[PDB]
């Protein structure tokens, strides 16, 4: 009768460092959205939306209100972000397009960020911590450039302060188990920012708040 997802699936990973020099989690709930979890196989091109979803389903944790790809590919047709036969293409989002309708479903609010090429997160690790500290959701990371779209939750630093962020990657294809299965496979995991964030590269950014 109802959508079974995982929920806070980051509990239970090791701190990435020995000794962190300081660590912010998100506050509140979510769950992992990911390829075919409702049904529709979205491979190869859906994995924003997933993340939005996983977006859209914070502070709660909540499915309930969270709308479907198709929903959300015919929201941006509605509002005129993209022509007629969007609803039903095989094209893919980024965090332009989940801002867009972050608003038009009342979701959490969507405040963009653009990171050119860089050391690190380009100056915006204490804006990391900040957000996460003052009640801040999960940030998406656009996929454009490296075709995969992820979605942070939280960031820490070792004594030199070498960057670390929780990232949680909507790839997965299949029926994951518990929150486990996830964390053994690293689909959920803290890495390294000069890893997940090449210096060659430009990301979007979308944080959440509430």
Not at 45 to 56: A, I, V
Not at 168 to 186: F, I, M, S, V
Not at 192 to 207: A, E, T
Request: aromatic share 10%.
């Amino acid at each position: 009768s109802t959508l079974e997802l995982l929920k806070d699936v980051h509990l239970g990973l090791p701190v990435p460092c020995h000794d962190p020099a300081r660590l912010a989690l998100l506050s509140g709930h979510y769950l992992y959205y990911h390829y075919g979890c409702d049904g529709l196989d979205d491979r190869g091109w859906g994995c924003g939306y997933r993340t939005l979803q996983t977006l859209c389903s914070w502070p709660g944790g909540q499915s309930s209100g969270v709308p479907g790809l198709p929903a959300l590919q015919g929201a941006l047709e509605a509002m005129g972000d993209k022509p007629p036969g969007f609803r039903g293409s095989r094209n893919w989002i980024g965090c332009v397009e989940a801002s867009l309708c972050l608003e038009h479903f009342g979701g959490p609010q969507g405040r963009l960020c653009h990171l050119p090429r860089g050391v690190g997160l380009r100056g915006e690790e204490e804006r990391l911590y900040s957000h996460f500290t003052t009640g801040g959701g999960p940030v998406m990371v656009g996929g454009d450039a490296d075709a995969q779209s992820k979605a942070l939750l939280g960031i820490c630093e070792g004594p030199g302060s070498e960057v670390y962020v929780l990232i949680l990657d909507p790839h997965y294809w299949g029926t994951p188990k518990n929150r486990c299965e996830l964390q053994a496979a690293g689909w959920v995991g803290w890495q390294k920012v000069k890893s997940v964030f090449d210096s060659n590269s430009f990301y979007n950014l979308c944080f959440t708040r509430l």
